[PDB]
């Protein structure tokens, strides 16, 4: 088959460590600077001091109750108390699974009681969302003050590190748990492993030529939210294992970001677009010292170049499921190559990338469409306690499909061309095929099923479904049609139901739903 890779070579990437101890490896050579900048209050944390705390976090954490495997619900803006209880949690060999601060009652309960959270930590402002969903055995734990019984975060940063459990964590165990996109459904557990992350960060930052140049010399803004696995991931645990003071911002005002970066000496600043536009296009920059500027992350490619010439311009792209990072641009590695613009980068070195046909499964040459696979360590281990979409996902040779097309060209350049193509269009509606097929599947006289969209005159394209049922079954369409009926909003609906022997599916065993739908292009 055609597999492609990194324009950068393997490096060595350790196996038998937990996610901590790889990340603060190195703590002797920077043992005294800055790690954690609060930047609201100006607080500094040194890197002796996030490493003692986190033992003593993860002692308090068994104090109160919380054991390995034992999940804990992050609910906090970025700031340091959100590291200090990720590492802790790390060392405690318990998982963390973090959302956002401003996310309603209703979803943050779902995505506590989904995630069999037992603490959840979070500010008092916020435990009025959460009340009704601790009355209905999980701990809430704030890191301000202490509404009513809540626990304080002071029982943890303040706890004896002497008596912290000795704990043996397997490489494989799962560390973090972000919950998936909506894309392909109903938002998934993303088990993120020790040796997975582990895998992710090294890819970006180890080697003598590592694909970002980050160093202890550097000042890694975190602007972006810590809840979200990129910056979890590209920030936090990134800026960690090199040693790197990270200036954290729980909210900022932009406009006067140029003074932050100024004042801190930002060498390194990941930001959104609109926040980049803006100080790209501001009158005073030549009144700043921007100096220290060294990487802007991710037109107006054209003009941040233009206006930040000591900079340089990173691109990459991610996938919750791919760890998440897939692919980044070389513009910043210790021995920088430039991108053509419109590409996202090159696969993450220690993997492997394939370029699928969407209907027979076959690989892909270079300068050909197809949807974007990806293979190696950095992945997750799967959705929470769902094995079955986690097959249907990750097929058995461990190829991730993404489930974006997209290709490769003479460069070893990657080129995104569309995301969210297994989408239906219903009436200006978005049906993914795989929240049907789970529970199409569900039915005990179903043992496989694909659905894909038949065009239709008025809606566009309606859910339709390829249904093996199990030999003896004498299950009507009908009958099909209103199981599913009854457990999904009227637009996600299957309209039309076909029996078949078996659903077309590739070696791999990813089931090839693009070429169902070819075979209904006639009706």
């Not at 324009?7 to 350790?14: A, G």
């Not at 901590?20 to 609201?40: D, F, M, Q, R, T």
């Not at 960060?201 to 140049?213: C, E, H, I, R, T």
């Not at 199990?470 to 309209?495: G, H, L, N, P």
Request: aromatic share 8%; hydrophobic share 40%.
């Amino acid at each position: 088959e055609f597999i492609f890779r990194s324009k950068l070579p393997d490096i060595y990437i350790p196996k038998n460590l937990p996610l901590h101890s790889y990340v603060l490896e190195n703590l002797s050579n920077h043992s005294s600077k800055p790690c954690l900048i609060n930047g609201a209050n100006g607080d500094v944390y040194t890197y002796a001091d996030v490493e003692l705390t986190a033992r003593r976090v993860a002692s308090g954490l068994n104090k109160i109750g919380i054991q390995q495997g034992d999940v804990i619900m992050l609910f906090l803006p970025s700031s340091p108390e959100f590291v200090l209880a990720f590492l802790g949690a790390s060392h405690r060999g318990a998982i963390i699974t973090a959302a956002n601060p401003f996310s309603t009652p209703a979803e943050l309960a779902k995505h506590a009681k989904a995630s069999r959270a037992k603490l959840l930590i979070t500010q008092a402002c916020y435990y009025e969302k959460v009340k009704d969903f601790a009355r209905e055995d999980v701990k809430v734990m704030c890191v301000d003050s202490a509404p009513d019984g809540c626990l304080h975060f002071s029982e943890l940063t303040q706890a004896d590190e002497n008596e912290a459990p000795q704990v043996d964590i397997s490489p494989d165990d799962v560390v973090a748990l972000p919950y998936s996109s909506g894309t392909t459904g109903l938002p998934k557990g993303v088990m993120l492993t020790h040796k997975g992350l582990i895998t992710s960060v090294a890819q970006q930052v180890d080697g003598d030529n590592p694909n970002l140049y980050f160093h202890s010399e550097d000042v890694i803004l975190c602007v972006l939210p810590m809840f979200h696995i990129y910056a979890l991931n590209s920030i936090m645990l990134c800026g960690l294992r090199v040693g790197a003071p990270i200036l954290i911002m729980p909210k900022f005002e932009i406009g006067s970001l140029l003074g932050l970066i100024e004042k801190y000496k930002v060498s390194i600043a990941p930001v959104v677009p609109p926040v980049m536009m803006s100080i790209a296009k501001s009158p005073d920059l030549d009144k700043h010292d921007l100096s220290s500027l060294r990487m802007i992350k991710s037109e107006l490619e054209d003009t941040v170049r233009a206006k930040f010439p000591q900079a340089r311009l990173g691109q990459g792209y991610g996938m919750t499921e791919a760890g998440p990072v897939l692919a980044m641009c070389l513009a910043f590695a210790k021995e920088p190559f430039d991108i053509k613009p419109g590409a996202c980068g090159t696969v993450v070195r220690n993997a492997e990338m394939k370029i699928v046909d969407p209907e027979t499964g076959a690989s892909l040459p270079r300068n050909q469409p197809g949807e974007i696979c990806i293979r190696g360590d950095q992945i997750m281990k799967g959705y929470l306690n769902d094995p079955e979409a986690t097959s249907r996902t990750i097929d058995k040779e461990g190829w991730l499909h993404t489930g974006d097309i997209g290709y490769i060209d003479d460069d070893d350049e990657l080129f995104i061309v569309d995301r969210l193509k297994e989408l239906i269009k219903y009436k200006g509606f978005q049906v993914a095929p795989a929240e049907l097929e789970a529970l199409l599947i569900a039915h005990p006289e179903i043992s496989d099923a694909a659905v894909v969209g038949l065009k239709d005159e008025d809606a566009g394209e309606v859910p339709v479904a390829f249904v093996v049922k199990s030999e003896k079954s004498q299950a009507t369409e009908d009958e099909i049609k209103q199981y599913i009926s009854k457990q999904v909003i009227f637009y996600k609906r299957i309209k039309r139901v076909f029996f078949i022997e078996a659903i077309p599916k590739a070696p791999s065993g990813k089931i090839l739903r693009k070429n169902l739908k070819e075979k209904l292009a006639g009706i």
